[PDB]
C-alpha cells in the first residue's frame, strides 16, 4: 500500500527541521541513493561510494562525478565545450 502520501524517503526525519528543508533535501536524498546507468557495461549498477565517487557493482569501473548525482548539469556543458574547442584546434 501507499505508506506515505508525499513524504517519501524524508519520512526518516519525522517532524524535525521544517517542511521546506525536508522538501529541499528530498531531491538530493533520492538522487544519491539511486542506481545509475553504466556507460561501460550497460547496466543500472552504479551507486555512490562517497561524495563525488561512483562505482559500478558489475564491471568495477569507478567514476568521479557529482556530489549527489553521477553527472552534474555543468559536467555535460563542459564536455561539449571542450569537444567543440578540440575540433577547431584539431582541424
Amino acid at each position: 500500500t501507499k505508506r506515505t502520501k508525499k513524504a517519501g524517503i524524508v519520512g526518516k526525519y519525522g517532524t524535525r527541521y521544517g517542511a521546506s528543508l525536508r522538501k529541499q533535501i528530498k531531491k538530493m536524498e533520492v538522487s544519491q541513493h539511486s542506481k545509475y546507468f553504466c556507460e561501460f557495461c550497460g547496466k543500472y549498477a552504479v551507486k555512490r561510494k562517497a561524495v563525488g565517487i561512483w562505482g559500478c557493482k558489475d564491471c568495477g569501473k569507478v567514476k568521479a562525478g557529482g556530489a549527489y548525482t553521477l553527472n552534474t548539469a555543468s559536467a555535460v556543458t563542459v564536455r561539449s565545450t571542450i569537444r567543440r574547442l578540440r575540433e577547431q584546434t584539431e582541424s
Partner: protein, 251 residues
C-alpha cells in the same frame, strides 16, 4: 582583558589541522622535460576519498622518464575521470577532460582546474569540488594568460603554467542542507577545531570586545579598520559596506 579566541588560533595547539587520515598532498607531477616538450601517459588506478576534502582524488601511475620504476601521483579528480582511463600530461597532450596541459596550449574559453600560479608549483588555483577556471585570452608578446578564478577575479599567469582540463569533481556538495548540529560536528571533526562557535556578545568583556552589558548588544560599530591590532580586530574587518547586498553590489 584576556587573549580572545581569534588570537589563540595562531599559536597552534588545539587549533592545528586534523590530518591523521589524509592521503597526502594532491598535486601535478614535477615539471620535467617530457611535459615541457612532448607528453607522458598515465593511468588512473583508483578514485579515493580524502577526509576533510570534498573533491575526490585520483591515484595515477606513470612510467619514470629515466629510472626503471613506477612513479605514483595523486591528482585532484576532475569530473568525468574514471579508473583505467589514460591521462596525458605535457605540452602536446590533446584537449580532453583529465589531461594536464600548459595554458599556452589551451584555447580561449576552456574550462580548467588546479591551475598553477608559478610555473612548476604543481597547482594552487581552482581545486575545490565543482570549481574551475576559464581561460580568457592569451598575450603572446608578454607570454602570459588571463584566467577567471572561481571568485570571479581575473588574474595574469605565465603561459607555461599547467592546468587540468575540466572542472573539479564532486560539485553541488554545499547545496544539500546539513539539517543537524551532528552533521556539522562530523564535517569539522576531520577539518580542525573551529566548531561550534560562541558569539562574542554572549561572552564577558574580559574575553571579547562585544562582551558584557545588561543586554546582548555590540555597543559600537562592528566594522573595524584594517590596521586594528590583534585582539581589537573583531567583527566586519575593513568593511567597504554592510547590509543586504541588493543591486549591482550582489553581482
Amino acid at each position: 582583558g584576556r587573549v580572545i579566541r581569534a588570537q589563540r588560533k595562531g599559536a597552534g595547539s588545539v587549533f592545528k589541522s586534523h590530518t591523521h587520515h589524509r592521503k597526502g598532498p594532491a598535486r601535478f607531477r614535477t615539471l620535467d622535460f617530457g611535459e615541457r616538450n612532448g607528453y607522458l601517459k598515465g593511468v588512473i588506478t583508483e578514485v579515493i576519498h580524502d577526509p576533510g576534502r570534498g573533491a575526490p582524488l585520483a591515484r595515477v601511475t606513470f612510467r619514470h622518464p629515466f629510472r626503471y620504476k613506477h612513479q605514483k601521483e595523486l591528482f585532484v579528480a576532475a569530473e568525468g575521470m574514471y579508473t583505467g582511463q589514460f591521462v596525458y600530461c605535457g605540452k602536446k597532450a590533446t584537449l580532453m577532460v583529465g589531461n594536464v596541459l600548459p595554458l599556452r596550449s589551451i584555447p580561449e574559453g576552456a574550462v580548467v582546474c588546479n591551475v598553477e600560479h608559478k610555473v612548476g608549483d604543481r597547482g594552487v588555483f581552482a581545486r575545490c569540488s565543482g570549481d574551475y577556471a576559464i581561460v580568457i585570452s592569451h598575450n603572446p608578446d608578454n607570454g602570459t594568460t588571463r584566467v577567471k578564478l572561481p571568485s570571479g577575479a581575473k588574474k595574469i599567469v605565465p603561459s607555461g603554467c599547467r592546468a587540468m582540463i575540466g572542472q573539479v569533481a564532486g560539485g553541488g556538495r554545499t547545496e544539500k542542507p546539513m539539517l543537524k548540529a551532528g552533521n556539522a560536528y562530523h564535517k569539522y571533526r576531520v577539518k580542525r577545531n573551529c566548531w561550534p562557535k560562541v558569539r562574542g556578545v554572549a561572552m564577558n568583556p574580559v574575553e571579547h570586545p562585544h562582551g558584557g552589558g545588561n543586554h546582548q548588544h555590540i555597543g559600537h560599530a562592528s566594522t573595524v579598520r584594517r590596521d586594528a591590532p590583534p585582539g581589537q580586530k573583531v567583527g566586519l574587518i575593513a568593511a567597504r559596506r554592510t547590509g543586504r547586498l541588493r543591486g549591482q553590489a550582489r553581482a
